[PDB]
């Protein structure tokens, strides 16, 4: 049993979600290579633009569609790397990087290539500087998909510390800034490093809780659920419950950290918007993770 | 404030708590060499027999007093050792072991020596077999009252595994069996290893939760989890309290499995319920003992 404990974070959903979802789903159904119509149907049921709209509820109205397209293609690729080597998968993504920079033109007969090319081209055409700024965060993530990670002894504290620097979570934060047109200086971002880390941990542990069965089966792992279960000698289900409570403590910490930024006179209007958006990512990720069929509801 | 989360367990006290407490308190007031009157007031206030009855509420009526006398002298010695060096403390207790065994006569002029001597003689008189079986558990504990703890980097898992082997909790379980007249075979004890480990952690973490402020005046689950999760000690206490409730669920699940499999004997059934009350009793004790105060 997994009844989420009480939370003071209320998730928000972008008002254009219905409009942008059919637009973006419509686009991929027209160009992406879907095998059977069971796939087409399963794709629309996945609601990739829906998650995006829970992650970035305050994205600017003419920018939410870029984020939806980027995460939709990234999720589609994710499904694909699953049935690929390490070498196959690394080769696959790698080709897409120069295409993303616009340095290499796409083969108009390969959907993934032209979809990626046109997407980035459209982002540069809307806001060149901000689009270029999310290039590396996206590539860091893409390359990280196909890792190859040094195995070593890692307890709960080492694991959480590690997730504070998760590149997938840094990507969401970067894409959030682009989507909201939030130009923040590294000086301003310096000021909220603890809030970013705490947020990265919350997102990773909530994903751990809900994707445990998924990962476990495909494993037949490095996740807070298995680690806490082993350290406390309880079942994975019991470990999820305990981690959920820890997630609420990080929600409280987020609030205390935000109040300190403000109290120390370090907040700026851009930082106030940024930290509030991080909160939406944490609560939105929770709602989605517990309802999506991706982790088999 | 710190509100304990919901629990299906509840504290319970031995029915004879009033009579036994008077009987055992009087014995010590008569023999134990308390410095001043104040000491006698503090001693009666600590109510070691009442603590004992909260931990072993299902003890047999004619055996609960042996448990109150043993923990009482052990509590008194604990305090004294506080005013002694490692070496002296070790010699002090080491002198009492042959005496507990009945191998060496006590110096009738030194109360702690004859009190210990007589208590063990009397237990052996009530149930030789069972009295002899709790000898080593008491000595392991007595020798631990003075051993040196080495500091080393320790995560939550390492800490919990260390607490699973806590000699104090081991003592409690062995004395509970003696007090309840439960003679378990090696096969029965082997069968409940996981249940014992789970209970030992529960007792230890609950103690941690409530002893933290006092300790923060080092080696505790409250500080370790707060550092590992990067939250405050109060937050860590809240998370650990929920972990404790999970251990209670686990205790119930493990006992059900024991029974499911044809392995729960009448002795083990009494024993695992006994541990349930040690967990609920320890929680109440932790919440109210002056040992953790200010
Ligand atoms: C294209 C995808 C999934 C993610 C890029 C964007 C992200 C970070 C969205 C946030 C949520 C997400 C599912 C993870 F962080 C990763 O989960 P994990 O790494 O454990 O994979 P799964 O949990 O989905 O199995
Ligand atoms: C007779 C004594 C003192 C111990 C053996 C008998 C026991 C375990 C009685 C139980 C209740 C108690 C004193 C605690 F739970 C404290 O454990 P703990 O004693 O570890 O608290 P600290 O000694 O760490 O301050
Ligand atoms: Mg996952």
From Swiss-Prot, chain A:
Q: Which reaction(s) are listed as its catalytic activity? A: (2E,6E)-farnesyl diphosphate = (+)-aristolochene + diphosphate
Q: Which residues bind Mg(2+) 1?
A: 78
What's the record's note on cofactor binding? Binds 3 Mg(2+) ions per monomer.
Q: Which EC number(s) are documented for this chain?
A: 4.2.3.9
Which key words are in the record? Answer: Lyase, Magnesium, Metal-binding
Residues where (2E,6E)-farnesyl diphosphate binds: 294-295
Q: Where is the signal peptide?
A: none
In which residues is Mg(2+) 2 bound?
78
What pathway does the annotation place this protein in?
Answer: Sesquiterpene biosynthesis; aristolochene biosynthesis; aristolochene from farnesyl diphosphate: step 1/1
| Record protein name field | Aristolochene synthase
Organism, per UniProt? Aspergillus terreus
Q: What is the lineage of its organism?
A: Eukaryota, Fungi, Dikarya, Ascomycota, Pezizomycotina
Gene, per the UniProt record:
Ari1
């Amino acid at each position: 049993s997994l009844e989420p404990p009480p939370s003071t974070f209320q998730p928000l959903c972008h008002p254009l979600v219905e409009e942008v979802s059919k637009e973006v789903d419509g686009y991929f159904l027209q160009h992406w290579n879907f095998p059977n119509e069971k796939a087409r149907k399963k794709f629309v049921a996945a609601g990739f633009s829906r998650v995006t709209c829970l992650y970035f509820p305050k994205a600017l109205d003419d920018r939410i569609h870029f984020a939806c397209r980027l995460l939709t293609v990234l999720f589609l690729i994710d499904d694909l790397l699953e049935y690929m080597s390490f070498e196959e998968g690394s080769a696959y993504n790698e080709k897409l990087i120069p295409i993303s920079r616009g340095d290499v033109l796409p083969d108009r007969s390969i959907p993934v290539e032209y979809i990626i090319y046109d997407l980035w081209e459209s982002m540069r055409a809307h806001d060149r500087e901000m689009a270029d700024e999310i290039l590396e965060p996206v590539f860091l993530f893409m390359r990280a998909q196909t890792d190859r990670t040094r195995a070593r002894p890692m307890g709960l504290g080492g694991y959480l510390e590690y997730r504070e620097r998760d590149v997938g979570k840094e990507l969401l934060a970067a894409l959030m800034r682009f989507s909201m047109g939030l130009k923040l200086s590294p000086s301003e971002l310096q000021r909220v490093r603890e809030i970013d880390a705490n947020c990265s941990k919350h997102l990773s542990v909530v994903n751990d809780i809900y994707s445990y069965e998924k990962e476990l089966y495909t494993s037949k792992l490095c996740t807070s659920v298995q680690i806490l279960a082993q350290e406390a000698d309880v079942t994975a289900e019991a470990a999820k419950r305990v981690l959920f409570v820890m997630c609420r403590e990080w929600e409280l910490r987020h609030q205390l950290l935000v109040a300190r930024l403000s109290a120390e006179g370090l907040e700026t209007p851009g930082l106030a918007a940024y930290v509030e958006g991080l909160e939406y990512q944490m609560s939105g990720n929770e709602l989605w993770s517990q309802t999506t069929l991706r982790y088999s509801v």
